[PDB]
Design a protein around this ligand. Sequence first.
Ligand SMILES: OC[C@H]1O[C@H](O[C@H]2[C@H](O)[C@@H](O)[C@@H](O[C@H]3[C@H](O)[C@@H](O)[C@@H](O[C@H]4[C@H](O)[C@@H](O)[C@@H](O)O[C@@H]4CO)O[C@@H]3CO)O[C@@H]2CO)[C@H](O)[C@@H](O)[C@@H]1O
Length: 451
Amino acid sequence: SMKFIKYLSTAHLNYMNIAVYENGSKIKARVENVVNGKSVGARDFDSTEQLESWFYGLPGSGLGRIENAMNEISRRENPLEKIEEGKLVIWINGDKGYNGLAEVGKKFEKDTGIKVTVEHPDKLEEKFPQVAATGDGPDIIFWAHDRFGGYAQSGLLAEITPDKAFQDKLYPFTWDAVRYNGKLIAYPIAVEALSLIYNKDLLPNPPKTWEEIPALDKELKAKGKSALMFNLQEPYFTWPLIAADGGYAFKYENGKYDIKDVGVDNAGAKAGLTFLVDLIKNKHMNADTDYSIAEAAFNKGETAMTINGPWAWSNIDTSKVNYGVTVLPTFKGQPSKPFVGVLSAGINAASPNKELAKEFLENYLLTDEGLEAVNKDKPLGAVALKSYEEELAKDPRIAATMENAQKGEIMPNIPQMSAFWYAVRTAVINAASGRQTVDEALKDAQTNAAA
Ligand SMILES: OC[C@H]1O[C@H](O[C@H]2[C@H](O)[C@@H](O)[C@@H](O[C@H]3[C@H](O)[C@@H](O)[C@@H](O[C@H]4[C@H](O)[C@@H](O)[C@@H](O)O[C@@H]4CO)O[C@@H]3CO)O[C@@H]2CO)[C@H](O)[C@@H](O)[C@@H]1O
């Protein structure tokens, strides 16, 4: 879906260039490190013609104009469309099929004359609670369900009330993910869980255990390859290893979560992160690997494995790597325990388009045809819609997604999940980079999560 076409500049500036991709039916241009593929920024374009007209229209010339292009593409991507009556503004994260969703918007616009804009503003899930509070932001926000309880607690979300027959179309556990204080606060879309992704040409049988990875990396470095690369910057990707042997966010009792019973600093969590840091101290992995570096390395056949969600699969299809999707490795004999997210669509309490939003979500998006259009852009994984899931469940990659999900946990949607994530992210980066030891990083994470 992300298919490389060319570098824009004939000469690399400071080992940076602008990588131009065919992105489904659109174009994406990224400011990339030409050595490790690290992406510094990106913007979408309708077509190569629009890309060039934009580029030929920038100030400067020669390499100076490339630089200006890089500065424009690499600066923060801010919300552009403002809420208006008779329009829908949608925010969804940049790794999801937002062009497919826009196509669902076009079906809505054809039927109703209401235009539907889709954006992926940077840090949309942080921008939302600050601007929706004051009447701005989008009509509809997409994120995994863990963010939504914080939003609901602050009054930022309309209560959603699909009728019983609509509720019967989605799996009951996906409704539970978006239930907060006895109210539905979002429409569940898809069920996400990390899986192990491996190159069958480098690795016909993936390791069952994390403990095999150091030896695997040893023999692959000899052939100039890596065993495993994945995004070390976001705790979502490292959590499954941290949870495997006992780590948890909040203990869920008979009825509720106990925000005072935090488990980011127990023996299991310490063991998982220690194994992670040991991979780095032994140079099997690099503390600076982010999402783009790992993706580029795996899709070019430089590393035998990665850890990612379904939103990444079609990029690998395009790369033509002979890949498999399978259950995460065990740690200490215990299954890796990924946090399961339910991609969910909430309606802004400040939206003046609440009935149009409901109509868009229920009768356009949450249909076999609507989800397929999104899925064709970036795969959704398992979907909350039973009719569509029963067809997707025949795909072994979906079966593997659900196996990892079943070995994991649905994320809590309580307000403090935000604090938990921020604390675990700081703990992993500090332990990975050697700014802190494992024990002292997880001790601080313990503190920051429960406050
Ligand atoms: O300033 C530091 C960083 O702060 C911001 O990131 C925060 C988010 O605001 C928090 O919400 C949380 O993020 C969670 C996320 O809520 C959770 O759903 C999951 O995200 C997955 C997602 O489900 C999946 O579909 C796919 O998109 O991958 C996501 C993981 O990247 O896990 C997140 C935690 O890793 O915590 C993060 C900080 O870690 C801000 O957005 C960052 O840009 C900023 O650097």
